[PDB]
Swiss-Prot record, chains A, B:
Activity regulation as described: Inhibition by cyclosporin A with a Ki of 25 to 50 mu-mol, a concentration 1000-fold higher than that required for eukaryotic PPIases.
A Gene Ontology biological process term: chaperone-mediated protein folding
PPIase cyclophilin-type domain mapped to chain residues: 1-162
Record organism: Escherichia coli (strain K12)
One Gene Ontology cellular component annotation held by this UniProt entry: cytosol
Domain of life where this protein originates: Bacteria
Keyword Nuclease among record annotations: no
Keywords: Cytoplasm, Isomerase, Rotamase
Family membership noted in the UniProt record: Belongs to the cyclophilin-type PPIase family.
Listed name of the protein: Peptidyl-prolyl cis-trans isomerase B
Role summary: PPIases accelerate the folding of proteins. It catalyzes the cis-trans isomerization of proline imidic peptide bonds in oligopeptides.
GO molecular function: peptidyl-prolyl cis-trans isomerase activity
Catalytic activity, EC: 5.2.1.8
Protein location: Cytoplasm
Amino acid sequence: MVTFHTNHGDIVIKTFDDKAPETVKNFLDYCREGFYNNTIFHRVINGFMIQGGGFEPGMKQKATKEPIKNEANNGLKNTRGTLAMARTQAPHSATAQFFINVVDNDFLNFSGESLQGWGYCVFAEVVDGMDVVDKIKGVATGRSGMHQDVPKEDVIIESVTVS
Amino acid sequence: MVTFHTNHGDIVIKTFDDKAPETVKNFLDYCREGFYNNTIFHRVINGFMIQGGGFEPGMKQKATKEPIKNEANNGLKNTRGTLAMARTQAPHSATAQFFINVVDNDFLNFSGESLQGWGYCVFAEVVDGMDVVDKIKGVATGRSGMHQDVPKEDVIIESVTVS
């Protein structure tokens, strides 16, 4: 289990170690190293998802390890409450950013090993604290340069407890 | 010179071959191959920029060649009318997507060879058709899945003439 202690409250998560081995191993290493402590949810889209794991307050970009392979062919779907890895246009580009589905985002699901089908890898799920997730999805946002949907007041993962 | 023949009119551009050699060579190869024909401006932000070169009508993602090295240390600034390469969080991640500055976006300028300073590489400038660029920046947009700021009616680069 992993708990995100945020300035809005705790979010407890169980990881799907057996269904997304490389992804979970990647995630837990960043958690154990304290990589996510003092990072924010920099992209919040009501009715869609909340994304975090890449910047410190003040939009300060953190350096990450090598990207991981997309494991979305594990068949897990992007339903409300699940956590998937954020990635660039390339399928094997995920590093540290992840997002939480606040609704079922079926359009994000894997549909085949192609550039257009690969989708987004679900590796975990919220088992407690969805009401904290729902409080965060509703905060006021704005543009912050290149970045859109940035919360006006920082949503901070203060520390993370692994198990 | 390169002309983008769009469904809103022509946009003529001169490239800075000597100041961004790898970038211009990359750009002109995609132009010559017909890579940009039938692609759209998928991200339009009024008062900021219009971005294109990666999708076909219907948000169909195109495959690209290997990424290029960031040449933003060439000192060129992101002023109104210039074209810079769009990239991911990593500095050496640009492929085919580019954007047009519709205002001076100083915050995008290179400030040192660091993850936080690298900025965005200016490789060209609009010499004719800025009024077409200004017509495009104002079109109605919406969310289209993972993508924000997508034009409701497609803004299409029909064909491209190189010189």
